[PDB]
Amino acid sequence: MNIFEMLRIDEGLRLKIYKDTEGYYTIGIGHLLTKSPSLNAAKSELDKAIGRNTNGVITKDEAEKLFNQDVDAAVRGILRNAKLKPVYDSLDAVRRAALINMVFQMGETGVAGFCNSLCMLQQKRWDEAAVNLAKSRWYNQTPNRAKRVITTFRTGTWDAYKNL
Ligand SMILES: *SCC1=C(CS*)C(C)(C)N(O)C1(C)C
Ligand SMILES: [Cl-]
Ligand SMILES: [Cl-]
Ligand SMILES: [Cl-]
Ligand SMILES: [Cl-]
Ligand SMILES: [K+]
Ligand SMILES: [K+]
């Protein structure tokens, strides 16, 4: 297991535009296109992202290219973020993947909204952090994914992604 495999499990793979869990047009492995309700706006964003006129359909290779860019940008963003970098740097590689997963799903600003949990993680109070992480909109709206991510933070293992 690694961050790519983990996010592939949590995000799926779809080659046509679809709506994510929040109703927003997305493609590939969780590549958000736009929050606009306009499908034509989403199709325009897709063509810009891929560099050709796609009409809403891409190949697996193209989905994986966007995914690699998105993972890279998430990590680089964490490192540029004065709130998230110290916590990231304090963690082992498995827990780092859980943090990247959260940032991929909700963005840097959203994860910075988890400061109470982030402090507990930085202090390596793993069970306390896990309890606090679940007191969130995130957990309520995507509980199965959140439970996997939280187990990864609690244990520092890949156990939640083993049967999957
Ligand atoms: S998210 C709140 C913050 C933490 C965790 S306790 C810390 C890394 C120490 N950081 O400076 C804050 C104030 C942003
Ligand atoms: Cl892009
Ligand atoms: Cl296709
Ligand atoms: Cl708590
Ligand atoms: Cl879920
Ligand atoms: K998804
Ligand atoms: K995403």
Side-chain angles (χ1 to χ4, degrees), residues 15 57-59:
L15 301 184
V57 177
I58 65 177
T59 68

mmCIF file of all heavy atoms in Angstrom, residues 15 57-59, ligand 3:
data_model
loop_
_atom_site.group_PDB
_atom_site.id
_atom_site.type_symbol
_atom_site.label_atom_id
_atom_site.label_comp_id
_atom_site.label_asym_id
_atom_site.label_seq_id
_atom_site.Cartn_x
_atom_site.Cartn_y
_atom_site.Cartn_z
ATOM 1 N N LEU A 15 -14.094 7.209 -16.074
ATOM 2 C CA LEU A 15 -13.534 7.845 -17.266
ATOM 3 C C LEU A 15 -14.469 8.859 -17.906
ATOM 4 O O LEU A 15 -14.092 9.507 -18.869
ATOM 5 C CB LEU A 15 -13.113 6.770 -18.284
ATOM 6 C CG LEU A 15 -12.059 5.785 -17.750
ATOM 7 C CD1 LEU A 15 -11.624 4.826 -18.853
ATOM 8 C CD2 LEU A 15 -10.832 6.495 -17.218
ATOM 9 N N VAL A 57 -14.992 12.649 -21.899
ATOM 10 C CA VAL A 57 -14.481 11.288 -21.760
ATOM 11 C C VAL A 57 -12.967 11.310 -21.864
ATOM 12 O O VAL A 57 -12.432 11.959 -22.770
ATOM 13 C CB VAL A 57 -15.090 10.387 -22.852
ATOM 14 C CG1 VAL A 57 -14.509 8.989 -22.777
ATOM 15 C CG2 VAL A 57 -16.599 10.362 -22.715
ATOM 16 N N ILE A 58 -12.280 10.587 -20.973
ATOM 17 C CA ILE A 58 -10.829 10.477 -20.996
ATOM 18 C C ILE A 58 -10.418 9.016 -20.917
ATOM 19 O O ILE A 58 -11.234 8.136 -20.664
ATOM 20 C CB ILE A 58 -10.170 11.291 -19.864
ATOM 21 C CG1 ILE A 58 -10.527 10.760 -18.449
ATOM 22 C CG2 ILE A 58 -10.461 12.765 -20.088
ATOM 23 C CD1 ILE A 58 -9.829 11.504 -17.317
ATOM 24 N N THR A 59 -9.136 8.767 -21.177
ATOM 25 C CA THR A 59 -8.555 7.437 -21.074
ATOM 26 C C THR A 59 -8.030 7.189 -19.660
ATOM 27 O O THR A 59 -7.844 8.108 -18.864
ATOM 28 C CB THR A 59 -7.424 7.264 -22.093
ATOM 29 O OG1 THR A 59 -6.352 8.125 -21.684
ATOM 30 C CG2 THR A 59 -7.933 7.589 -23.529
HETATM 31 CL CL CL B 3 -12.468 6.299 -22.228
#
